[PDB]
Amino acid sequence: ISFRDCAEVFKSGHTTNGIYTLTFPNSTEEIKAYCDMEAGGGGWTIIQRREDGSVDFQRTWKEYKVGFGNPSGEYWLGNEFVSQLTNQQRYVLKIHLKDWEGNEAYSLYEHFYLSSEELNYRIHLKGLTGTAGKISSISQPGNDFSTKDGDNDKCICKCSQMLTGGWWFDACGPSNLNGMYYPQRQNTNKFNGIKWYYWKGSGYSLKATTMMIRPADF
């Protein structure tokens, strides 16, 4: 059958980590996404992963709309599909973070969705639990998405060009998981690295990240 998200894939009994095909809501356009079926009860649709810096994230507005990368590794699932899903029903957002010394942390948001394209894919987040900080490193109320061409941020600057990525940037706010990747002994003092302020401060660049969504019914 078609499946809209990895939680349906899981309930059909495909309880194994892998790439699966998902269908746009009320349509026949297909997308391929990684499903995490073993962490936290499974059913997690990965929407972003960073691991090794093999993939550039300085992409245009159209690429962030469609998606880019490889679902086997570092990739962005695409704002359009995520906007179509998260406006159909309540999704949670879990963010998983690793540093170079070997620590783990996460943030959980009990409601996430994206506005439509005419509202520049603005983020909405509600609730916050977990260990990667007790204040949301994504600014609230959520900002418009911004990219090296689409300057929708509150800075008089171009945040996407100073911080080299596509993000809901503010001016320019406490986080950017789509920033530059810095390897094993260059990750400190990097203002444009993979940033999550309320866990490792500014200038520290993270080792790995994963953003993933699941229905709050699950």
């Epitope: 600014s139 509150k154 800075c155 008089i156 600057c157 945040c159 100073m162 911080l163 001016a171 320019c172 706010g173 406490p174 203002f191 302020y197 500014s202 200038g203």
Partner: antibody, heavy 120, light 109 residues
Framework: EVQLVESGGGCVQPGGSLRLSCAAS????????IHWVRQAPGKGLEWVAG????????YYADSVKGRFTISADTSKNTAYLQMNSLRAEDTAVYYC?????????????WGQGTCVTVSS | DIQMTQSPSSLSASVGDRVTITCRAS???????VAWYQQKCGKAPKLLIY???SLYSGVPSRFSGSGSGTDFTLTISSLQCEDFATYYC?????????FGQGTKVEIKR
């Protein structure tokens, strides 16, 4: 060398009007922001306005918004501040400054300043 | 608007002493956007430090800065008679571009 040279300050009546001119030398203003900063007698620095000449975007402090108007004239590499409905509070030294919007991200060069005295 | 509050409005210290100026923002500021300026009697200001902590060219290495988020600091590691000036923080990020109130350094002799 890089210079900014502002000119056209003076004495003017309250309610009067005046036009400061900041001439830039050694750089093309289109590649940087031009900002005006003022210092009232004995007071701190107040930021007045700024312009992006490659785009015409303009910004104003609340104190002057809708009274002053910053503009730029790339064919003369020059920036202007038209001042209208002047008041005693507008008495200050006015400096134009180059703002570098790439990595130094600061006002690295400043003009010498020009005096405006608003007094009957 | 973003309010920039400098905690000592003036300080007086002897030649050799170490002094620090603390500037506090009301909102998270990206540290690349914070700068410090020095002004001396009847002069235009000059840039000392950019990006919260980077020393500008030709500034004496006794100046240094640090901070992130809301809290930023300017240090003179050993005060010299020529450091008599007023020092201003600024945020260059969200319009309008507020300066701090300034801090005056007086030198004991």
């Amino acid at each position: 060398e890089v210079q900014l040279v502002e000119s056209g300050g003076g004495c003017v009546q309250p309610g009067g009007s005046l036009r400061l001119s900041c001439a830039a030398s050694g750089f093309t203003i289109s590649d940087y922001w031009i900002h005006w900063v003022r210092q009232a007698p004995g007071k701190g620095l107040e930021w007045v306005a700024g312009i992006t000449p490659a785009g015409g975007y303009t910004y104003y402090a609340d104190s002057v918004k809708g009274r002053f108007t910053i503009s730029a004239d790339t064919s003369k590499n020059t920036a202007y501040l038209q001042m209208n409905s002047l008041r005693a509070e507008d008495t200050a030294v006015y400096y134009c400054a180059r703002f570098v919007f790439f990595l130094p991200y600061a006002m690295d060069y400043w003009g010498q300043g020009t005096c405006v005295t608003v007094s009957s | 608007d973003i309010q920039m509050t400098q905690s000592p409005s003036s300080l007086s210290a002897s030649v050799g002493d170490r002094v620090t100026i603390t500037c506090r923002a009301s909102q998270f500021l990206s540290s690349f956007g914070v700068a410090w300026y020095q002004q001396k009697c009847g002069k235009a200001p000059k840039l000392l430090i950019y990006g919260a902590s980077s020393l500008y060219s030709g500034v004496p290495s006794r100046f240094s800065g640090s901070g992130s988020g809301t809290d930023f600091t300017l240090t003179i590691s050993s005060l010299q008679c020529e450091d008599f000036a007023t020092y201003y923080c600024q945020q260059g990020l969200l319009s309008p571009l507020t300066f701090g109130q300034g801090t005056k350094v007086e030198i004991k002799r």
